[PDB]
Structures are given as structure tokens and as C-alpha cells.
């Protein structure tokens with residue numbers, strides 16, 4: 722209570738423990754805390770089990786806290802949001818068995834180089850997954866099979882060279898897909914299925930414009946109003962779409978949706 726800032730009234734009880742050189746969870750915290758901020762601390766190691774006493778905790782922010790090892794012990798039955806962004810995790814924590822009600826997971830800007838087969842098992846309620854700014858080169862097929870309710874997916878600014886065929890199949894609620902600034906060369910045929918994807922970011926990739934890019938070319942033409950350019954700190958309020966941002970070899974004068982495709986089968 723005295724160490725961190727507390728704010729109550731209606732909605733819930735938010736506890737702010739940011740920037741306090743904390744190396745562990747303060748033993749002095751309101752048992753009814755619903756939102757806990759532990760950002761900007763020195764949590765090289767942290768154990769989720771230490772939060773079990775706080776039964777109403779629905780949001781936990783452990784971002785920018787030098788997090789290196791996250792111990793996933795017991796169970797936090799009502800935790801809905803977990804922010805682990807801007808930390809030093811080299812492996813994705815396996816959270817399914819501990820955070821069954823999780824809807825938002827942010828592990829952006831960590832040190833991930835790959836994702837395991839078990840990755841998202843058990844996170845059936847997941848709605849937002851952010852993995853921007855890591856160094857992923859490829860994704861396991863079936864990565865998103867445990868998360869059919871996904872609405873937002875961010876794989877921006879990684880090192881992806883290709884996407885698994887079928888990655889989006891089954892995601893009938895997907896509204897935002899961020900894939901900008903990777904090393905993507907093509908899009909698997911039928912990748913987007915028959916689902917309407919309102920916000921897609923595909924710029925900053927060295928698209929290879931050959932006959933294999935024709936599926937993507939047609940999709941871009943049919944979805945020109947759903948393609949956008951990312952702008953830090955700004956909501957896609959009504960931001961003007963810009964299909965021309967998706968370019969062959971990331972060359973400004975050669976947008977993929979204008980690629981002629983000379984010498985290519987129908």
C-alpha cells in the first residue's frame with residue numbers, strides 16, 4: 722500500500738508498482754487488487770505462483786522489467802491480460818495450464834528465436850497475441866490451432882521468410898493482422914480463405930513478384946481498403962488504407978497489386 726500507488730472506485734482496484742527497483746513481488750499488496758503494474762523494475766526472475774493469493778487479479782503488467790525467467794507454477798484462474806513486453810525472455814513461457822482464462826498475451830520485444838510445438842495449448846480464450854520485435858524466422862504449423870477466437874495477431878518486425886499454409890484457417894474472428902517489416906517473399910495460395918480481414922499490415926516485406934504471387938495480387942485488389950501502413954501510437958481510427966504499400970522487393974514504384982505477371986498461367 723505505502724510502497725506502490727493504489728487507485729480504487731467503481732471499475733476496480735489498480736495498483737501501480739512501476740519503477741521502484743523491486744526485485745520481487747511486494748508482500749504488502751491489497752488482497753483484492755484487480756490490476757497490477759510491475760513495469761520498469763528488476764524482475765530478472767519472477768514466479769506466477771506468488772500471485773495466487775490475489776484472487777481478483779485480472780491484469781498483470783511485467784513489461785520493461787528485465788524478465789529473464791518466468792516460473793509458471795500454480796494457477797491464476799481469472800487472469801485475463803499478461804504483458805511481458807520489452808523483457809529478455811529467450812523462450813516463450815508455456816502458459817496454457819496456468820492461465821486458462823487469458824485473452825491477451827504480449828511477449829513483444831523479447832529475445833525469442835522460435836516457438837515450440839506446445840506453445841499456445843490451453844489458451845482457448847486468447848483474443849490478442851503480440852509477438853512483435855522478436856527474431857522469429859519460421860512458425861510451427863498449428864501454432865494458432867489452440868486459439869480459434871483470436872482477433873488480433875502481431876508478428877511484425879521479426880525475421881520471418883515464410884508463413885505456414887493454413888496459419889489463418891479457423892480464425893473466423895480475426896480483425897487485425899500485423900506482418901510488416903519481416904522478410905516475407907510470398908503468400909501461400911488461399912491463405913486468407915473466405916474471411917474478411919479488416920486490418921492487414923503487409924508493408925516492409927521483400928515480396929517476390931513471380932507467378933506465385935498472383936493469389937496475393939488478386940487478394941490485394943479485392944481488399945485494397947483493408948490494407949494499411951503502421952504508425953506508432955496511432956489508432957486505425959479511419960486511417961486511410963494504402964494497398965500500394967505492399968511492394969515487390971519492397972520497391973516503392975512497384976506495388977504488388979499492379980504486378981503485370983507476364984508469362985503466368987491463369
Ligand SMILES: *[C@@H]1O[C@H](CO)[C@@H](O[C@@H]2O[C@H](CO)[C@@H](O[C@@H]3O[C@H](CO)[C@@H](O)[C@H](O[C@@H]4O[C@H](CO)[C@@H](O)[C@H](O)[C@@H]4O)[C@@H]3O)[C@H](O)[C@H]2NC(C)=O)[C@H](O)[C@H]1NC(C)=O
Pocket residue numbers: 856879880
Ligand atoms: C533479424 O532481422 C534484423 C533486421 O534486419 C537483422 O538486423 C540487421 O542485421 C544486419 C547484419 O548484422 C545489419 O547490417 C549491418 O549493419 C552494420 C551497422 O549498421 C553494418 O556495419 C554492416 O555492414 C555491412 O555488412 C554486410 C554483411 O552483412 C556487408 O556485405 C557490407 O559490405 C557491409 O560491411 C551491415 O550493414 C542491420 O543493420 C540490422 N538491422 C537492424 C535495424 O538492426 C538481424 O541480424 C536478423 N537476425 C538474424 C538472427 O538473422
